[PDB]
């Protein structure tokens, strides 16, 4: 049976998934007969390619015997078998082969670090998160940033490490993730840092967020400055918001500024504010 | 007779129309549900598609 | 090519040359 | 007749082109949301027509 | 033997293929609070706090 299915492996089928099915049923036949090390050897023989393999998987001009090492089915089932059978060193080697072969997924990066975190290797989990962040540009890399920043503030690493980590994350972010990113960098600066730091971060957060959610970002900035310092500190935020916002949001900010000035009692300034609002 | 009347190229074209129709229906359902389609597709991409789209 | 251009000029045909939605609300 | 002379003015100081455009745009703002509905269900029903044609072809190939 | 000899982290045996992070994201499996739904918590906190100060001023 092993001989004839070795011949089956030799058969050049039309689809690479068929020869994938051959290799997975070879390992499956071995694991039913309690030959786990033999199955590991079989699928180590399956994906035999040099360190500089770059062949196209979908190129329907080469034989599928050679363009099968870059098939995700064999590698996924193989690394689950190695994880359930062998030790941590071999599984790390097989993931390293995944990352060398350039077929890894953000799901695979998260799986790497979850495997490390179950074995309490937190620093290497951080290392493989930001290696995945290096490999994936940014609209892919928001998910990795979510998990990585959550686990980094979970473990409570050094404060300068977290500061440089968010400054790395914020660097080339779209606004649609900049909202969340700045919200947590200000949040951490409030929780385990200095207040004026969080104030300047909320300021440049208002500066670098999308048009649709800029008004809510000034709302958060105003509420946090009111909870933090006096309303006299909240005035420059108000006239900056009038200076930068479009007409409807500037109207809303101007009405709230007039409300604050009427609350303080300096209704001459509130009247001038209302005059400006009436101008636009 | 049905196999002789139906060309396999036509069958593959109809299967591709199945695939693209299923994709656009699933896109419509996810965007109507409030979630983001491209974030989930960004969950499932390899390095190769990532750097070519980059 | 000079001979071909002269042939084209000589056999040039005089007989092939003759001279002389939606609604308004959306726009 | 107001199409030809639509660039003239009223007694108040409004152009006839201006008020015609204002009425047409008010009608468009009234009718635009229901048009974007009926086109989204139109493309939706076209999509189910495609999925019905393809389920017909796959059942035709499976039953012979 | 498969569900005791596969870690079920990268292979999906019901489809005879790998796990689809498109269908099954790893965001729902955390025992902690992911970075997206937090700061939605912070926005909600600031929102109902802000309505508390405006009703206190009223
Ligand atoms: C981040 N990243 C890689 C990435 N990010 C993307 O946002 C993205 C892609 N890739 N696209 C590529 O085109 C095919 C699907 O197109 P389609 O079904 O969407 O049809 P089309 O559109 O036509 C796929 O091959 C995909 O790779 C398309 N696309 C939008």
Coordinates of C-alpha atoms and ligand atoms in Angstrom, one line a residue:
Chain A
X1 CA 0.0 0.0 0.0
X2 CA 2.8 2.4 0.9
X3 CA 4.5 1.4 -2.4
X4 CA 1.5 2.1 -4.6
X5 CA 0.8 5.4 -2.8
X6 CA 4.4 6.4 -3.2
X7 CA 3.6 5.8 -6.9
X8 CA 0.5 8.0 -6.4
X9 CA 2.8 10.7 -5.1
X10 CA 4.8 10.3 -8.3
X11 CA 1.6 10.9 -10.3
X12 CA 1.5 14.5 -11.7
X13 CA -2.1 15.3 -11.0
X14 CA -3.9 18.3 -12.7
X15 CA -4.3 20.2 -9.4
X16 CA -1.8 20.8 -6.7
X17 CA -4.5 20.2 -4.1
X18 CA -4.7 16.6 -5.2
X19 CA -1.0 16.0 -4.5
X20 CA -1.6 17.9 -1.2
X21 CA -4.3 15.3 -0.5
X22 CA -1.8 12.6 -1.2
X23 CA 0.7 14.0 1.3
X24 CA -1.9 14.7 4.0
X25 CA -3.4 11.1 3.7
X26 CA 0.1 9.7 3.9
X27 CA 0.6 11.5 7.2
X28 CA -2.9 10.5 8.2
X29 CA -2.2 6.8 7.4
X30 CA 0.9 7.1 9.5
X31 CA -0.8 8.7 12.5
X32 CA -3.6 6.1 12.6
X33 CA -1.0 3.4 12.9
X34 CA 0.8 5.3 15.7
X35 CA 3.8 6.5 13.6
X36 CA 3.9 10.2 14.4
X37 CA 7.6 10.5 13.9
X38 CA 7.3 8.7 10.6
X39 CA 4.5 11.1 9.6
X40 CA 6.7 14.1 10.5
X41 CA 9.4 12.5 8.3
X42 CA 7.0 12.0 5.5
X43 CA 5.8 15.6 5.4
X44 CA 9.3 16.8 5.9
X45 CA 10.0 14.9 2.7
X46 CA 6.9 16.6 1.2
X47 CA 8.0 20.2 1.4
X48 CA 11.6 19.8 0.3
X49 CA 12.6 23.1 -1.3
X50 CA 15.8 25.1 -0.9
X51 CA 16.1 28.3 1.1
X52 CA 15.6 30.4 -2.0
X53 CA 12.4 29.0 -3.5
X54 CA 10.2 31.6 -5.3
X55 CA 8.1 29.6 -7.7
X56 CA 4.6 30.7 -8.5
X57 CA 1.9 28.5 -7.0
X58 CA -0.8 29.3 -9.6
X59 CA 1.6 29.0 -12.6
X60 CA -0.2 26.2 -14.5
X61 CA 2.9 25.4 -16.6
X62 CA 5.2 23.7 -14.1
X63 CA 4.6 20.2 -12.7
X64 CA 2.7 20.2 -9.3
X65 CA 5.5 18.1 -7.8
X66 CA 7.7 21.1 -7.4
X67 CA 5.1 23.9 -6.8
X68 CA 3.6 22.2 -3.8
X69 CA 5.9 23.2 -1.0
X70 CA 4.2 26.6 -1.2
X71 CA 0.8 25.1 -0.5
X72 CA -0.8 26.3 2.7
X73 CA -2.7 23.1 3.3
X74 CA 0.4 20.9 3.8
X75 CA 2.0 23.5 6.0
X76 CA -1.0 24.1 8.2
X77 CA -1.7 20.4 8.8
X78 CA 2.0 19.8 9.2
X79 CA 2.5 22.5 11.9
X80 CA -0.6 21.4 13.8
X81 CA 0.9 17.8 13.8
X82 CA 4.3 19.1 14.9
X83 CA 2.7 21.2 17.7
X84 CA 0.5 18.3 18.9
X85 CA 3.4 15.8 18.7
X86 CA 6.9 17.3 18.9
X87 CA 8.4 19.9 21.2
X88 CA 8.6 23.7 21.0
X89 CA 12.0 23.8 19.2
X90 CA 10.7 21.9 16.1
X91 CA 7.5 24.0 16.0
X92 CA 9.5 27.2 16.1
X93 CA 11.7 25.8 13.3
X94 CA 8.6 25.1 11.2
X95 CA 7.1 28.5 11.7
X96 CA 10.5 29.9 10.8
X97 CA 10.3 28.0 7.6
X98 CA 6.8 29.4 7.1
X99 CA 8.1 33.0 7.5
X100 CA 11.1 32.2 5.2
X101 CA 8.8 30.8 2.5
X102 CA 6.8 34.0 2.4
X103 CA 3.4 32.5 2.7
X104 CA 2.6 33.5 6.3
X105 CA -0.7 35.2 7.3
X106 CA -1.5 37.6 10.1
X107 CA -3.4 34.7 11.5
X108 CA -0.2 32.8 11.4
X109 CA 1.7 35.6 13.3
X110 CA -1.0 35.6 16.0
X111 CA -0.7 31.8 16.1
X112 CA 3.1 32.0 16.6
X113 CA 2.7 34.4 19.5
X114 CA -0.2 32.5 21.0
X115 CA 1.9 29.4 21.0
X116 CA 4.7 31.3 22.7
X117 CA 2.3 32.9 25.2
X118 CA 0.9 29.5 26.2
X119 CA 4.5 28.6 27.0
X120 CA 5.0 31.9 28.8
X121 CA 7.5 33.3 26.2
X122 CA 6.1 36.8 26.3
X123 CA 9.1 38.7 24.9
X124 CA 9.5 36.4 21.9
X125 CA 5.7 36.9 21.3
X126 CA 6.3 40.7 21.2
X127 CA 9.2 40.0 18.8
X128 CA 7.0 38.0 16.4
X129 CA 4.2 40.6 16.6
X130 CA 6.5 43.3 15.4
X131 CA 8.2 41.0 12.9
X132 CA 4.7 40.5 11.4
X133 CA 4.3 44.3 11.6
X134 CA 7.4 44.7 9.6
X135 CA 6.1 42.2 7.0
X136 CA 2.6 43.7 6.6
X137 CA 2.3 47.3 5.5
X138 CA -0.5 49.0 7.4
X139 CA -4.1 48.4 6.4
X140 CA -3.2 44.8 7.1
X141 CA -1.2 45.8 10.1
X142 CA -3.9 47.3 12.2
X143 CA -5.0 44.0 13.6
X144 CA -1.4 43.1 14.7
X145 CA -1.2 46.5 16.3
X146 CA -4.4 45.9 18.2
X147 CA -3.2 42.6 19.7
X148 CA 0.3 43.8 20.2
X149 CA -0.6 47.0 22.0
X150 CA -3.2 45.2 24.1
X151 CA -0.7 42.6 25.2
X152 CA 2.1 45.1 25.7
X153 CA 0.0 47.2 28.1
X154 CA -1.1 43.9 29.7
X155 CA 2.4 42.8 30.6
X156 CA 3.4 46.4 31.7
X157 CA 6.8 46.7 30.1
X158 CA 9.0 49.8 30.6
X159 CA 7.4 53.1 29.9
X160 CA 9.9 54.3 27.3
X161 CA 9.5 51.0 25.5
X162 CA 5.7 51.7 25.3
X163 CA 6.3 55.3 24.3
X164 CA 8.6 54.3 21.4
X165 CA 6.1 51.4 20.5
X166 CA 3.1 53.8 20.0
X167 CA 5.4 56.3 18.2
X168 CA 6.3 53.4 15.9
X169 CA 2.6 52.5 15.5
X170 CA 1.3 56.1 14.9
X171 CA 4.0 56.9 12.3
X172 CA 2.2 56.2 9.0
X173 CA -1.3 55.3 10.1
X174 CA -4.5 56.1 8.3
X175 CA -6.8 58.4 10.3
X176 CA -9.4 55.7 10.6
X177 CA -7.0 53.8 12.9
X178 CA -5.3 57.0 14.2
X179 CA -8.4 57.7 16.3
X180 CA -8.0 54.5 18.4
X181 CA -4.2 54.7 18.4
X182 CA -4.1 58.2 19.8
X183 CA -6.9 57.4 22.2
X184 CA -4.8 54.7 23.8
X185 CA -1.5 56.6 23.7
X186 CA -3.2 59.5 25.5
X187 CA -4.9 57.0 27.8
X188 CA -1.6 55.4 28.8
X189 CA 0.0 58.8 29.2
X190 CA -2.8 59.6 31.7
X191 CA -2.6 56.3 33.5
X192 CA 1.2 55.8 33.8
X193 CA 2.7 59.1 32.8
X194 CA 2.1 62.8 32.9
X195 CA -1.0 64.9 32.2
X196 CA 0.5 67.6 30.0
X197 CA 1.9 64.8 27.8
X198 CA -1.6 63.4 27.4
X199 CA -2.9 66.9 26.6
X200 CA -0.4 67.5 23.8
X201 CA -1.1 64.0 22.4
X202 CA -4.8 64.8 22.3
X203 CA -3.9 68.0 20.6
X204 CA -2.0 66.4 17.8
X205 CA -4.7 63.7 17.7
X206 CA -7.2 66.4 16.8
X207 CA -4.6 67.5 14.3
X208 CA -4.2 64.0 12.7
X209 CA -7.6 62.4 12.7
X210 CA -10.2 62.1 9.8
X211 CA -12.6 64.9 8.9
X212 CA -15.7 62.9 9.9
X213 CA -14.5 62.2 13.4
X214 CA -12.5 65.4 14.1
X215 CA -15.4 67.0 16.0
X216 CA -15.7 64.0 18.3
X217 CA -11.9 64.2 18.9
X218 CA -12.2 67.8 20.0
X219 CA -15.1 66.7 22.2
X220 CA -12.9 64.2 23.9
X221 CA -10.1 66.7 24.1
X222 CA -12.4 69.3 25.7
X223 CA -13.9 66.8 28.2
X224 CA -10.5 65.5 29.2
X225 CA -9.0 69.0 29.6
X226 CA -12.0 70.0 31.7
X227 CA -11.6 66.9 33.9
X228 CA -7.9 67.6 34.1
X229 CA -7.3 71.3 34.3
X230 CA -9.3 74.5 34.5
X231 CA -11.6 75.8 31.8
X232 CA -9.2 78.6 31.1
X233 CA -6.9 75.9 29.8
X234 CA -9.8 74.7 27.7
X235 CA -10.3 78.1 25.9
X236 CA -7.3 77.8 23.5
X237 CA -8.6 74.4 22.4
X238 CA -11.9 76.2 21.6
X239 CA -10.5 79.0 19.4
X240 CA -8.2 76.5 17.7
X241 CA -11.3 74.4 16.9
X242 CA -13.0 77.4 15.5
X243 CA -9.9 78.2 13.4
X244 CA -9.6 74.7 11.9
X245 CA -13.0 73.1 11.6
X246 CA -15.5 73.3 8.7
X247 CA -18.5 75.5 9.1
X248 CA -21.0 73.2 10.8
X249 CA -18.6 71.8 13.3
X250 CA -17.2 75.3 13.9
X251 CA -20.8 76.4 14.5
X252 CA -21.2 73.6 17.1
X253 CA -17.8 74.4 18.8
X254 CA -18.7 78.1 18.8
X255 CA -22.0 77.5 20.4
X256 CA -20.4 75.4 23.1
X257 CA -17.7 78.1 23.6
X258 CA -20.5 80.6 24.0
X259 CA -22.2 78.3 26.5
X260 CA -19.0 78.0 28.5
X261 CA -18.4 81.8 28.5
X262 CA -22.1 82.3 29.6
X263 CA -21.5 79.8 32.4
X264 CA -18.4 81.7 33.5
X265 CA -20.3 85.0 33.3
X266 CA -18.2 86.9 30.9
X267 CA -21.1 87.5 28.5
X268 CA -19.3 90.2 26.5
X269 CA -16.9 87.5 25.2
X270 CA -19.9 85.2 24.6
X271 CA -21.6 88.0 22.7
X272 CA -18.5 88.4 20.5
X273 CA -18.4 84.7 20.0
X274 CA -22.1 84.8 19.0
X275 CA -21.3 87.6 16.6
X276 CA -18.6 85.5 14.9
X277 CA -21.0 82.6 14.7
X278 CA -23.6 84.9 13.1
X279 CA -20.9 85.9 10.6
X280 CA -20.6 82.4 9.4
Chain B
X1 CA -26.7 14.4 -24.0
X2 CA -26.6 17.2 -21.4
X3 CA -22.8 16.9 -21.1
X4 CA -22.4 17.0 -24.8
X5 CA -24.7 20.0 -25.1
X6 CA -22.9 21.9 -22.4
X7 CA -19.3 23.0 -23.2
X8 CA -16.8 22.7 -20.3
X9 CA -15.6 26.2 -21.0
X10 CA -19.1 27.4 -20.5
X11 CA -19.3 25.4 -17.3
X12 CA -16.1 27.1 -16.0
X13 CA -17.4 30.5 -17.0
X14 CA -20.6 29.8 -15.1
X15 CA -18.6 28.6 -12.1
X16 CA -16.6 31.8 -12.1
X17 CA -19.8 33.8 -12.3
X18 CA -20.9 31.8 -9.2
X19 CA -17.7 32.7 -7.5
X20 CA -17.9 36.4 -8.2
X21 CA -21.6 36.6 -7.4
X22 CA -21.0 34.8 -4.0
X23 CA -18.2 37.3 -3.3
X24 CA -20.3 40.4 -4.0
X25 CA -23.3 39.0 -2.1
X26 CA -21.1 38.3 0.9
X27 CA -19.6 41.8 0.6
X28 CA -23.0 43.3 0.6
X29 CA -24.1 41.3 3.7
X30 CA -21.0 42.2 5.7
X31 CA -21.2 45.9 4.8
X32 CA -24.9 45.9 5.7
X33 CA -24.2 44.1 9.0
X34 CA -21.9 46.9 10.1
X35 CA -18.6 45.1 9.9
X36 CA -15.7 45.9 7.6
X37 CA -15.1 43.5 4.7
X38 CA -11.5 44.5 3.9
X39 CA -10.4 44.2 7.6
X40 CA -11.4 40.5 7.5
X41 CA -9.8 40.0 4.1
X42 CA -6.7 41.7 5.7
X43 CA -6.9 39.0 8.4
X44 CA -6.5 36.4 5.7
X45 CA -3.7 37.5 3.3
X46 CA -0.3 36.0 2.8
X47 CA 2.9 38.0 2.6
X48 CA 3.0 37.7 -1.2
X49 CA -0.4 39.3 -1.8
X50 CA 0.5 41.9 0.9
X51 CA 3.7 43.1 -0.8
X52 CA 2.2 43.0 -4.3
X53 CA -0.7 45.1 -3.2
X54 CA 1.7 47.4 -1.4
Chain C
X1 CA 9.7 52.9 -51.3
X2 CA 10.1 55.9 -53.6
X3 CA 8.9 53.8 -56.5
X4 CA 5.9 52.6 -54.4
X5 CA 5.0 56.2 -53.4
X6 CA 5.2 57.2 -57.1
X7 CA 2.9 54.3 -57.9
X8 CA 0.5 55.4 -55.2
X9 CA 0.4 59.0 -56.5
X10 CA -0.1 57.8 -60.1
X11 CA -3.0 55.5 -59.3
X12 CA -4.7 57.9 -56.8
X13 CA -8.4 57.7 -57.3
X14 CA -10.2 61.0 -57.9
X15 CA -13.5 59.2 -57.4
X16 CA -13.0 58.6 -53.6
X17 CA -12.6 62.2 -52.5
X18 CA -15.5 64.5 -51.7
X19 CA -15.3 67.9 -49.9
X20 CA -17.8 70.4 -48.7
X21 CA -30.7 61.4 -22.6
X22 CA -31.3 61.7 -18.9
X23 CA -33.4 64.2 -17.0
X24 CA -32.6 67.9 -16.3
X25 CA -32.9 67.6 -12.5
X26 CA -29.9 65.2 -12.3
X27 CA -27.6 67.5 -14.4
Chain D
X1 CA -41.3 79.9 -23.1
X2 CA -39.3 80.3 -19.8
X3 CA -36.7 78.0 -21.2
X4 CA -35.6 80.4 -23.9
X5 CA -35.7 83.5 -21.6
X6 CA -34.6 81.8 -18.4
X7 CA -31.7 84.2 -17.8
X8 CA -33.9 87.2 -17.1
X9 CA -34.9 88.3 -13.6
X10 CA -38.0 88.6 -11.4
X11 CA -39.3 91.6 -9.4
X12 CA -37.4 90.7 -6.3
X13 CA -34.1 90.1 -8.1
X14 CA -34.0 86.4 -8.8
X15 CA -33.1 84.8 -12.1
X16 CA -35.6 82.5 -13.7
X17 CA -32.8 80.0 -14.3
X18 CA -32.1 80.2 -10.5
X19 CA -35.7 79.4 -9.5
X20 CA -36.0 76.6 -12.1
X21 CA -32.8 75.1 -10.8
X22 CA -34.0 75.5 -7.2
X23 CA -37.3 73.7 -7.9
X24 CA -35.6 70.9 -9.8
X25 CA -33.0 70.4 -7.1
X26 CA -35.7 70.4 -4.4
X27 CA -37.5 67.7 -6.3
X28 CA -34.2 65.8 -6.6
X29 CA -33.5 66.1 -2.9
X30 CA -37.0 64.7 -2.3
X31 CA -36.7 61.8 -4.7
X32 CA -32.9 60.9 -4.3
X33 CA -33.1 58.6 -1.2
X34 CA -35.9 56.5 -2.6
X35 CA -34.0 56.2 -5.9
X36 CA -30.9 54.9 -4.1
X37 CA -33.2 52.4 -2.3
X38 CA -34.8 51.1 -5.5
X39 CA -31.4 50.8 -7.3
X40 CA -30.0 48.9 -4.3
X41 CA -32.9 46.4 -4.3
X42 CA -32.7 46.4 -8.2
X43 CA -29.1 45.3 -8.1
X44 CA -30.0 42.9 -5.2
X45 CA -32.7 41.3 -7.3
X46 CA -30.3 41.1 -10.3
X47 CA -27.9 39.3 -8.0
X48 CA -30.5 36.8 -6.9
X49 CA -31.4 36.3 -10.6
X50 CA -27.7 35.4 -11.2
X51 CA -27.7 33.1 -8.2
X52 CA -30.9 31.4 -9.4
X53 CA -29.4 30.9 -12.9
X54 CA -26.3 29.4 -11.4
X55 CA -28.2 27.1 -9.1
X56 CA -30.2 26.0 -12.1
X57 CA -27.0 25.2 -14.0
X58 CA -25.4 23.3 -11.1
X59 CA -28.6 21.2 -10.5
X60 CA -28.7 20.6 -14.3
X61 CA -25.1 19.3 -14.2
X62 CA -25.7 17.2 -11.1
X63 CA -28.9 15.5 -12.3
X64 CA -27.6 15.1 -15.9
Chain E
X1 CA -7.4 10.5 16.2
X2 CA -7.3 13.9 14.4
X3 CA -8.9 16.0 17.2
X4 CA -6.3 14.6 19.5
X5 CA -3.3 14.6 17.2
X6 CA -3.9 18.0 15.6
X7 CA -3.7 21.2 17.7
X8 CA -6.6 22.6 15.7
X9 CA -4.9 26.0 15.5
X10 CA -4.1 26.1 11.8
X11 CA -5.9 23.2 10.2
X12 CA -9.7 22.9 9.7
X13 CA -10.6 19.2 9.4
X14 CA -14.3 19.8 8.5
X15 CA -13.2 21.5 5.2
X16 CA -10.1 19.3 4.7
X17 CA -8.0 22.5 4.7
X18 CA -6.5 25.3 6.7
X19 CA -8.4 27.4 9.2
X20 CA -9.9 30.5 7.6
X21 CA -9.2 33.7 9.6
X22 CA -11.7 35.4 7.3
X23 CA -14.5 33.1 8.6
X24 CA -13.0 32.6 12.2
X25 CA -11.0 35.6 13.3
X26 CA -8.7 35.3 16.4
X27 CA -10.2 38.5 17.8
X28 CA -13.1 36.6 19.6
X29 CA -10.8 34.1 21.4
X30 CA -9.0 36.5 23.7
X31 CA -9.5 36.4 27.4
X32 CA -8.6 40.1 27.5
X33 CA -10.1 43.3 26.1
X34 CA -9.0 43.9 22.5
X35 CA -7.8 47.4 21.4
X36 CA -10.8 48.1 19.2
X37 CA -13.7 47.7 21.7
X38 CA -11.6 49.5 24.2
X39 CA -11.6 53.3 23.3
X40 CA -15.1 52.6 22.3
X41 CA -15.5 52.0 26.0
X42 CA -13.5 55.3 26.5
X43 CA -15.7 57.2 24.0
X44 CA -18.9 55.9 25.8
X45 CA -17.4 56.8 29.2
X46 CA -16.6 60.4 28.0
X47 CA -20.0 60.7 26.4
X48 CA -22.2 59.8 29.4
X49 CA -19.8 61.7 31.7
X50 CA -20.2 64.8 29.4
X51 CA -24.0 64.5 29.5
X52 CA -23.6 64.3 33.3
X53 CA -21.8 67.6 33.5
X54 CA -24.2 69.3 31.1
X55 CA -27.2 68.1 33.1
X56 CA -25.4 69.2 36.3
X57 CA -24.9 72.6 34.8
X58 CA -28.5 72.7 33.7
Ligands
LIG1 C1 -4.0 44.0 1.4 N1 -4.3 43.3 0.2 C2 -3.4 42.2 -0.2 C3 -5.4 43.6 -0.6 N2 -6.2 44.7 -0.1 C4 -7.4 45.1 -0.9 O1 -8.0 46.0 -0.5 C5 -7.7 44.4 -2.2 C6 -6.8 43.4 -2.7 N3 -5.7 42.9 -1.9 N4 -7.3 42.8 -3.9 C7 -6.7 41.7 -4.7 O2 -7.5 41.5 -5.8 C8 -8.1 40.0 -5.6 C9 -9.5 40.1 -5.0 O3 -10.1 41.2 -5.8 P1 -11.7 41.6 -5.5 O4 -12.5 40.3 -5.3 O5 -11.8 42.5 -4.3 O6 -12.2 42.3 -6.9 P2 -11.6 43.7 -7.4 O7 -11.9 44.9 -6.5 O8 -12.0 44.0 -8.8 C10 -7.3 39.3 -4.7 O9 -6.3 38.6 -5.5 C11 -6.7 40.4 -3.9 O10 -5.4 40.1 -3.7 C12 -8.5 43.6 -4.3 N5 -8.8 44.6 -3.2 C13 -9.8 45.6 -3.1

